[PDB]
Ligand binder design. Structure first.
Ligand SMILES: [Mg+2]
Ligand SMILES: [Mn+2]
Ligand SMILES: [Mn+2]
Length: 271
């Protein structure tokens, strides 16, 4: 009752180990849930190319992810995408919005990912994902997601220009200190839900965080969101941007934390 799809093709990656982090996350989910992932795309090295170059390079991977996600969304299972970068979602979010026009997208990210070609300072496609799916610029992979149906969760320290694009489009923002499970439920109302996570939303892991207030979201806050969304309402989940080398102890520890956060939703879908 879980469909696992894994992107292994470059989609604008500027970090070295996000394809490897996706592979390791997928492996952990396969072992825990008795699944076999559908792996899509061919790895290629990271580079600091402009979105206008990285985007056409990624077309074959994006099209193949789109076709796999479409089948899964049209079937009866929970669609789980383990993605190297948020930019994979330029292919998936238009499908979600077309198949489920009432869905709310929870875009859980330390960033807004709401830049356009006019506003980006770095040229990075991964900073342009939600705005592209919402049609503020044309990714070549469709749009159709209403900004009114998108909620940024955990985002903070957003550039002033980008924050005003978000405001003018109607995208709600729930910063980490407001991102309780109930605050997220209040934003979703009766809608079916698609969850997209960029792991940079998380507070940088620190042993002694009992006496300071975190700037990012805590793993417990992410877990509480997964516990709160009714299984009958969850369309799918994207897990993106784990930058951890294959075979590293660090990846081993990171995927254990990931499995703990997603367990309430994935356990329910598996049962
Ligand atoms: Mg489903
Ligand atoms: Mn992101
Ligand atoms: Mn981010």
């Amino acid at each position: 009752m879980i469909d696992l799809i894994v992107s292994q093709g470059r989609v604008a990656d500027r970090a070295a180990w996000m394809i490897e982090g996706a592979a390791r996350t997928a492996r952990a989910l396969e072992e825990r849930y008795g699944l076999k992932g559908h792996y899509v795309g061919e790895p290629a090295p990271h580079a600091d190319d402009d979105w206008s170059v990285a985007l056409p390079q990624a077309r074959e991977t994006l099209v193949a992810v789109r076709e796999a996600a479409t089948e899964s969304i049209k079937g009866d299972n929970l669609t789980v995408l383990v993605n190297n970068t948020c930019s994979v979602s330029l292919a998936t979010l238009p499908v979600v919005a077309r198949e489920h026009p009432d869905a709310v997208v929870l875009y859980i990210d330390g960033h807004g990912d709401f830049n356009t070609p006019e506003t980006t300072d770095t040229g990075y496609l991964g900073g342009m994902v939600l705005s592209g799916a919402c049609g503020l610029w044309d990714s070549g992979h469709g749009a159709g997601l209403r900004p009114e149906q998108a909620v940024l969760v955990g985002s903070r320290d957003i550039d002033e220009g980008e924050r005003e694009l978000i405001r003018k489009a109607g995208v709600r923002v729930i910063p980490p200190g407001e991102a309780t499970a109930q605050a997220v439920l209040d934003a979703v109302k009766d809608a079916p839900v698609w969850i997209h996570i960029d792991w940079d939303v998380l507070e940088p892991g620190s042993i002694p965080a009992d006496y300071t207030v975190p700037d990012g979201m805590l793993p417990a806050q992410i877990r509480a969101v997964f516990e709160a969304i009714p299984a009958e309402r969850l369309i799918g989940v994207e897990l993106a941007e784990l930058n951890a080398p294959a075979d590293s102890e660090r990846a081993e520890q990171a995927v254990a934390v990931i499995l703990d956060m997603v367990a309430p939703a994935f356990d329910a879908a598996a049962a």
